[PDB]
Every structure is written in C-alpha cells, then in structure tokens.
Design an enzyme around this catalytic site. Structure first.
Site, PDB file in Angstrom:
ATOM      1  N   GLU A 167       7.962  -2.958  14.726  1.00 48.39           N
ATOM      2  CA  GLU A 167       8.098  -1.529  14.408  1.00 48.39           C
ATOM      3  C   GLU A 167       6.752  -0.820  14.486  1.00 48.39           C
ATOM      4  O   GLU A 167       5.768  -1.298  13.908  1.00 48.39           O
ATOM      5  CB  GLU A 167       8.651  -1.346  12.993  1.00 48.39           C
ATOM      6  CG  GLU A 167       9.169   0.080  12.809  1.00 48.39           C
ATOM      7  CD  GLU A 167       9.742   0.403  11.444  1.00 48.39           C
ATOM      8  OE1 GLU A 167       9.489  -0.358  10.483  1.00 48.39           O
ATOM      9  OE2 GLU A 167      10.439   1.443  11.334  1.00 48.39           O
ATOM     10  N   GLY A 206       2.034  -3.876   4.438  1.00 50.83           N
ATOM     11  CA  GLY A 206       2.386  -4.681   3.289  1.00 50.83           C
ATOM     12  C   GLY A 206       3.504  -5.644   3.645  1.00 50.83           C
ATOM     13  O   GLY A 206       3.475  -6.807   3.253  1.00 50.83           O
ATOM     14  N   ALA A 207       4.512  -5.156   4.385  1.00 51.51           N
ATOM     15  CA  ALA A 207       5.703  -5.966   4.673  1.00 51.51           C
ATOM     16  C   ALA A 207       6.541  -5.271   5.770  1.00 51.51           C
ATOM     17  O   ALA A 207       6.192  -4.165   6.228  1.00 51.51           O
ATOM     18  CB  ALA A 207       6.527  -6.165   3.373  1.00 51.51           C
ATOM     19  N   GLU A 222      11.863  -3.694   0.966  1.00 49.90           N
ATOM     20  CA  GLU A 222      12.383  -4.329   2.183  1.00 49.90           C
ATOM     21  C   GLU A 222      13.867  -4.572   2.109  1.00 49.90           C
ATOM     22  O   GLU A 222      14.556  -4.414   3.127  1.00 49.90           O
ATOM     23  CB  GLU A 222      11.641  -5.633   2.487  1.00 49.90           C
ATOM     24  CG  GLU A 222      10.127  -5.449   2.584  1.00 49.90           C
ATOM     25  CD  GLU A 222       9.663  -4.287   3.432  1.00 49.90           C
ATOM     26  OE1 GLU A 222      10.264  -4.084   4.509  1.00 49.90           O
ATOM     27  OE2 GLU A 222       8.704  -3.580   3.042  1.00 49.90           O
TER      28      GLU A 222
HETATM   29 ZN   LIG Z   1       9.725   0.935   4.585  1.00 47.41          ZN
END
Ligand SMILES: [Zn+2]
Ligand SMILES: O=C(Cn1c(=O)sc2ccc(-c3ccccc3)cc21)NC1(C(=O)O)CCCCC1
Length: 857
Positions: A139, A273-274, A310
């Site tokens: 992404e 972060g994730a 998430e």
């Molecule tokens: Zn997000």
C-alpha cells in the site's frame, strides 16, 4: 513504437477477475522470478492491454483463450512506459468482447532494498548469525513492483498465490497453506488457498524463519502471531488482544471475518507502524511485541491500539475499500476511530477514550494552515497518494466521525455503518455512499458532512453571553466565506447535562432557562472546532479552573488550555491571559490537562533554544518546573498504578531530569550508577528508565555503557529508551555518529532513522546537524523512504519546524525549491514553511511579552 496510453489512470474497459501469482525468491542472491496469470474480460474491442509494472524485467508475455483441447495461445509484444509505471501488451488480433482471456507474464526482479515492494529484511540471532528474510509492503502503489497488475484499488480480484522456496524457510501469505510440493532443484512450492475478491495493495507474502503461536476465536478463526524465534516469547499479549478484538468487531459489525485465519507478523524492518493485509497483518516489532518486564505502559497501549487499527481495516478497508485514494479517509479515519470504539470495550483498564481528543488537537495544528487540504481531495501520482497517509485522513477523519457519532447517537451511527458495510461488501465506495448509508437509518448527514470533508480547516466558534442570551458565531480559524454545520455542545454552572445546538449558519442565538455563572462549549472536546468567549468569558473560565477545577472534566480542562493558546496565535486572547490561565496547573493531577499544558508550553522554549535567548529560555524552563513541582515531587520511582499514572510518572521524571531539577537528577544518577555497577543485570522500574538513561548518557562513560547494552537487547521499549538517551548527548561527534549509523542501518536499523533525526533536530546543541544531514543525504533518504511518505514528511518537519528566523526560513525555501521534481512540491515543505512563518510572527509579537510576564511571575 510510441506508448499507446497517455493517462496515469488505467483504461476502464479491461477488467481482471482472478490472478494466479507464482513467485520464486532466491534469498542468497536477492533475485526473484515470477509468473503472473491474470484472467480478464474486455468491454470494448481492443488489441492492447495496459497494466502496471515497475522495476520488473519482462521476459515473455502471452494471451490465452479457452481451456483444455480448445486452448489457444497468442504471443504478446511488450512496450513499457516507466514514468507512468505501465506496460502495454499487444495482441496479434482484437480480444472478443465479454469473453474470458488469461494474460500470462514471465518476469524477474531484484528484492527491494527499501521498505516497500517485495523487500529484504534482516536480523542477527542472539548467537551472532545474520539472517535474511523477504516480506511485502504494497500500500498504496507498490504491488506493481512484485507482480504486473491492474494496480488501482477498484480493480478487485481473487488471488491464488504460490511460492517456491528453500526447505529451510517458511512461507506465509493471505490465505491458509493448502499443499506443499517438492519441485526441481531442491525447492518446495507452497500453494495458498484463493483469496476473496480484494484490492492488489492487500496481497502479502513472507519468506522467513519465523516461529508462531496461535489461539482460536469463538467463531473458529485461527489467529496467530509470527516473529523471529528469539522474540516469539513476546507474542502472547498481542495474540490475546487480537482474538478479543476480532471477536469484538465480528459482533459489533454483525459481519463475520470471512477468512479461516488471521496472522499478525512482526517484521524486523518495517517503515510505518503496521499494515492491514487481509489474513496477514504486518507490524514493526515495536508495534506488536510485549516484554512484561521491560515494555512501557505506553507501548502496551500502542500495541493494543495498533492491533485494533489493523483488525478494524479487515472491514473498513479490506471488505469495503475506497474507490480511489482521494477518499483514503474512508479506510483510515474509520480504522483510527474504531481503535477507540473497540478498545474502550475490550480493554477498559486502558481508559483509551480519555486520550481520543488528543488526536483532534494534533490534526488542528496542521489544519489551521493554508497548506492543509480537505479530508477528500484529488490525487493522481504515487507521491501525491502517499501524502494522503497524514494527520488529516487519520486524525481529522476520526475526529469528524466521533463528532458525527455523538450527533446521531452511537446506536444510529452503528446502524449506519452496518448497512454501509453490508451494502458495499467486496466493492468500493466514495464519500457520498457513506452519507447515503448514514441517512438510511430510521437525519440528513450529507450537507453537514460535506462541510467537514470538502473544505479545509475548522471553525472558531465565538460565544457572547448577556444574561440568558447566548449569541453564537462561526468563522474559519486560520493562522497568518467557509461555513460548517457544527453540532455544538455545552454545559453550564447550573446544568451538567450535555446540551446540544446545531449551528448551521454564520450566527444564531439560544436563550438559557436561567442566568448562569459560566458556560463551557465543546463538552469533552468531542467537536472539531475551537471556542472563544467574549467579554468576561475567559476570566470566568480562568477563575473556574483556579478555584474549582473539578467543576469540569479533565478533558474539558485540557480543551480550555489548548484553545486559550490557539487564540493567542490569532490575536483573540493575549499571551499573558493564556499564561495566567496555565497557572491553575500547579493543582492539576490528571494526565490529559498536564500533557496539554506541556503541548502548549514546551514548543515555546523549543523555539527559544534555537535563538539567542538564553536568559528567557532558562527563566521559562524554571517557570515550567516550578509550575509542576508539587506533582513531580509526589511521583514514586516505581511501576505502580494505572496506565495513565505510569505514563504521567515517566514523562514528569524525564522532564524534571532534562531541565536539571536536582532532586530528580540525583535520584536518576544513583539508579544509573547501581544499574551500571551491576553490569546492567539489575531490573530498573520501566517508568523511571527514560529519566535514568537520559541522565546516565550525559557522561562519556555512561553513553558508552548504554550503547554497549543496545546490541544485546531484545526489548523494543529498551532499545527506544536507549536511542532517546543517546540522542540527548551534547557531544556533536556522537550525534553525527548516531545519524551516520542509523542511516547506514547496521548498528542501528534504518527504520529508526526518522525518529533519531527528529530527536537530534530537537537537541538544544545538535539541532543544526539534523537539518544539515537531511539536506546532504536527501537523495538517498528519498530513495529509501519515498517522496510523499509520512517518513519524509516527519523528517522535513522534525528538522525545521522549530525555526523562527527569516534566515532559517530562506534556508528551507531555498533548499526545497532547488530540488525541482525531487521534492519542491511536497505538501510537508509548504507546511513547514507556513509553520516557520507563524513561528517568526509569534516570537516577534510575544517574546518581549513573555520576558516581562516571567519577571512579574
Ligand atoms: Zn490504517
Ligand atoms: O521538547 C521535547 C519534545 N517536544 C518538542 O520538541 S515540541 C513538544 C510538545 C510536547 C511534548 C510533550 C508532551 C507531553 C509530555 C511530554 C512532552 C514534547 C515536545 N522533549 C523534551 C525537550 O527536548 O526539552 C525532552 C524530553 C522531555 C520533554 C522535553
């Protein structure tokens, strides 16, 4: 032969339905090869297929039609347009409309040395061995760097992934492993089940030596945490939190999680972060792994919120996805908001709801400038799309959803989001779809929410009280014609019920039932607006905080502190009256108003540290310590109490030590000496470790000892605490070493470089080194992190946004303008320029006022 397509967006008439992706990564040479087969249909006759591909060497492309005995292959000629990141496949005859075809492409690539695409990650075992793994991060637009595809989020399709790997490695992907087959030359081919229909940016695969732990939800979903073998013992907290949060969301949305399993993998090198890849969420090790003996209270909160974010995306982003990146907030604002909705229920001990408003004040800082953009705004190229992952999409997006939920009521809001997710499942949406769903319950939300999503900024609401008459006015708040539908709320000295009033116009009036001693708008800071009070209003509220501060909630006190200082910036309240209000903090006990006081006051001395203002800087710091002295003195040097009590303790002790408050410095020196003398074996209270390390690193011996422990640490908190402490050194050779080493990535990973650069940018002696380093190493930093990334935005702001002279402003304008296409048009650059312009005006107006006020105080 010229390229037969001249648009950044792909043609709309060739649509994929399914991809078969075969990937072979050779971790010894970092080369990878793939075969992509994409089933497509064309709605208009074309002999040309345009799709995305970036840094892939295409060896052959073929077009298949039919199956079995009727299989007809046709070779395709390949053209490339590297600037548009596209390839064109040319067939010898036109495709027949509405009939299925399969494009087969064979290609090779090299594993990326960045944090995106199919990239290399490494770590060292506690035994000293360098280990190499390969992981993905696509992404927004990097799937095209791993396999050729129609790489736009509205081209949803199913994916069947096959990975060829060495027997010594494990491969995981979005879906369960259904078969492993031995193939030629000692390799094993893993076959993963077909995904549900989804966007290309959610495809994921990892080839590693990871260990795992698992737990099954009440719904039968297998949840696992994956991490390097030396760190799998830190996975239990996130595993338990993930099961609880997935169960919460399934019940809350009334839509089950549709895949058989959900993985959470801690990657040794990770930029953000994730990431929410469906069935295979990925994280920085610091955002997932918890060491019950060394992790901080803030890190426990952070892991819980990151996992909640998430997992929210499995519905808000994966099941329902924005049609295009102009509406990224439909994914990000919702996932950020759902962290607070879910964790408020699943982990009530964290009291996360108390912290939510803080995100709104963060968004207001950026959103008060002309360089802010509306929540929904057009974007076209990858750098512009990466710029949408910012505080406007995330924090302003979450804040306007909180304001909408409070306005509609939680149950009506919940009904709207359930209808929205059900209706648009496995499809894509735009803003209008959300308003239509919210309105389908039982209130028109479109006109109101268009004001909050299609206009930048936020309003200043001005309140004027004359007896029972309450006059309200709105205007755009700007530092340096807009109109909103504002759901106002208020309480008064006679009523603590939350009163509601919808202000849809420039002005309005309401009549109180009886006269009051005070009125306070924006209850709990649930609205995305600030409030000014005319006449004696600010004196009444200052008196309320000074005499009976518990008359309003902790969040209401934090909102008054923030708004008073925001009003100084636009000339509505003098700096003296805002500083006079801040004096009430000598009796404040709660984390949110104390931290909001620090958020307003600390930046004033950070500006002074970079100016010839030693005397006023010293007096201002002494005033701050004197203001919070009683609360600092009350802190125990332990890990006792609630998460809020622990976070407050840690920051107060660190603040006191940094500003040379001798009682705290002496205690920190003693703990550091005993910790060092015991060869760092001794367990210190985690909550005092930042203060202890920051003091200890002020000598050459202490700095060296602290750095000597860094290589052995398996604790993300301890590594972060050591990095912070080392960055406080006033030895410029050590500061330059930290920048050089984290940039290189060997002794300190490059994933820490953006934070280290900002920390050195905020060091009172080393700040010139950080801005110098950013300019000198710009090209390599852009190559590693990408133009438009939040990492580059944080580096630009972190090194420059505390400057306050015309000379520094010209350095910034001159450097970034010189970059032309490699950075001159970054939104973060315009933001830092406007921030420095405000700093110049604010200091010119208020410096002497603060100098005089401090002498009187
Ligand atoms: Zn997000
Ligand atoms: O100043 C900063 C960083 N900082 C900025 O540069 S602008 C900014 C606004 C708020 C905060 C903050 C809010 C809450 C709690 C604690 C801090 C921090 C901050 N750090 C310290 C320093 O370099 O003097 C050093 C560590 C103790 C705190 C002081």
């Amino acid at each position: 032969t010229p390229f037969p397509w001249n648009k950044i967006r792909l043609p709309e008439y060739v649509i994929p339905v399914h991809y078969d992706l075969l990937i072979h990564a050779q971790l010894t040479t970092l080369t990878f090869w793939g075969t992509t087969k994409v089933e497509i249909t064309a709605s208009q006759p074309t002999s040309t297929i345009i799709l995305h591909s970036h840094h892939l060497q295409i060896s052959r492309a073929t077009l298949r039609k039919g199956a079995g005995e009727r299989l007809s292959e046709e070779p395709l000629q390949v053209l490339e347009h590297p600037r548009q990141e596209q390839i064109a496949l040319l067939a010898p005859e036109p495709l027949l409309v509405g009939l299925p075809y399969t494009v087969v492409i064979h290609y090779a690539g090299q594993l990326s040395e960045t944090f995106h695409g199919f990239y290399k990650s490494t770590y060292r075992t506690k035994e000293g061995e360098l280990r190499i793994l390969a992981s993905t991060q696509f992404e927004p637009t990097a799937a095209r760097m791993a396999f050729p595809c129609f790489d736009e989020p509205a081209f949803k399709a199913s994916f069947s992934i096959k990975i060829r790997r060495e027997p010594r490695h494990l491969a995981i992907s979005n879906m369960p492993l259904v078969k492993s087959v031995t193939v030629a030359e000692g390799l094993i081919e893993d076959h993963f089940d077909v995904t549900v229909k989804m966007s290309t940016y959610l495809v994921a695969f990892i080839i590693s030596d990871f260990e795992s732990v698992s737990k099954i939800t009440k719904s039968g979903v297998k949840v696992s945490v994956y991490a390097v073998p030396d760190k799998i013992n830190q996975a239990d907290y996130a595993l338990d939190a993930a099961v609880t949060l997935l169960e919460f969301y399934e019940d809350y949305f009334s839509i089950p999680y549709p895949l058989p399993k959900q993985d959470l993998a801690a990657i040794p090198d990770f930029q953000s972060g994730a990431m929410e890849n469906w069935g295979l969420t990925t994280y920085r090790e610091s955002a997932l792994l918890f060491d019950a003996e060394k992790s901080s209270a803030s890190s426990k909160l952070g892991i819980t919120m990151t996992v909640a974010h998430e997992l929210a995306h499995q519905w808000f982003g994966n099941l329902v996805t924005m049609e295009w990146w102009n509406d990224l907030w439909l994914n990000e604002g919702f996932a950020k908001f759902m962290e607070f909705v879910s964790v408020s229920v699943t982990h009530p001990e964290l009291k996360v709801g108390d912290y939510f408003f803080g995100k709104c004040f963060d968004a207001m800082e950026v959103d008060a400038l002309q360089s802010s953009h509306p929540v929904s705004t057009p974007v076209e190229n990858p750098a512009q799309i990466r710029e949408m992952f910012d505080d406007v999409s995330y924090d302003k997006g979450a804040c306007i959803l909180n304001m909408l939920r409070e306005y509609l009521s939680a149950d009506a809001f919940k009904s709207g989001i359930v209808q929205y997710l059900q209706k648009h499942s496995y499809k894509n949406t735009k803003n209008e779809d959300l308003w239509d769903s919210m309105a389908s319950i039982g209130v028109d939300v479109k006109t109101m929410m268009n004001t909050w999503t299609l206009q930048r900024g936020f309003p200043l609401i001005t309140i004027t009280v004359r007896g029972r008459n309450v006059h309200m006015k709105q205007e755009h708040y700007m530092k340096g014609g807009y109109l909103w539908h504002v759901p106002l709320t208020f309480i008064t000295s006679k009523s603590d019920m939350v009163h509601r009033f919808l202000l849809k116009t420039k002005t309005d009036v309401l009549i109180l039932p009886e006269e009051v001693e005070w009125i306070k708008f924006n209850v709990g800071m649930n609205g995305y607006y600030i409030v000014h009070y005319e006449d004696d209003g600010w004196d009444s509220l200052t008196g309320l905080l000074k005499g009976t501060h518990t008359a309003v909630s902790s969040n209401d006190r934090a909102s008054l502190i923030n708004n008073a200082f925001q009003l100084v910036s636009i000339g509505k309240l003098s700096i003296e009256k805002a500083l006079d209000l801040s004096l009430y903090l000598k009796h404040e006990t709660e984390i949110m108003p104390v931290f909001q006081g620090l958020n307003e006051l600390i930046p004033m001395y950070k500006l002074m540290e970079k100016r010839d203002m030693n005397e006023v800087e010293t007096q201002f710091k002494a005033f701050l310590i004197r203001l919070l002295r009683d609360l600092i003195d009350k802190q125990t040097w332990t890990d006792e109490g609630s998460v809020s009590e622990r976070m407050l303790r840690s920051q107060l002790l660190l603040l006191a030590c940094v500003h040379n408050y001798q009682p705290c410095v002496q205690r920190a020196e003693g703990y550091f000496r005993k910790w060092k003398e015991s060869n760092g074996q001794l367990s210190l209270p985690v909550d005092v470790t930042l203060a202890v390390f920051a003091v200890g690193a002020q000598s050459t011996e202490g700095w060296d000892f602290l750095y000597s422990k860094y290589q052995f640490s398996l604790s993300s908190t301890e590594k972060s605490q050591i990095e912070f402490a080392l960055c406080r050194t006033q030895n410029k050779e050590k500061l330059q070493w930290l920048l050089d080493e984290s940039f290189k990535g060997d002794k300190i990973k490059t994933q820490e470089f953006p934070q280290i650069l900002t920390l050195i940018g905020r060091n009172p002696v080393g700040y010139p080194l950080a801005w110098q380093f950013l300019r000198k190493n710009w090209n390599k930093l852009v190559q590693k992190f990408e133009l438009g990334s939040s990492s580059i935005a944080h580096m630009v702001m972190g090194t420059t946004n505390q400057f306050s002279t015309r000379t520094r402003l010209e350095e910034v304008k001159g450097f970034f303008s010189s970059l032309k296409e490699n950075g001159s048009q970054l939104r973060c650059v315009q933001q830092t320029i406007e921030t420095i312009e405000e700093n110049i005006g604010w200091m010119d107006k208020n410096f002497d006022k603060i100098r005089v006020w401090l002498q009187s105080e």
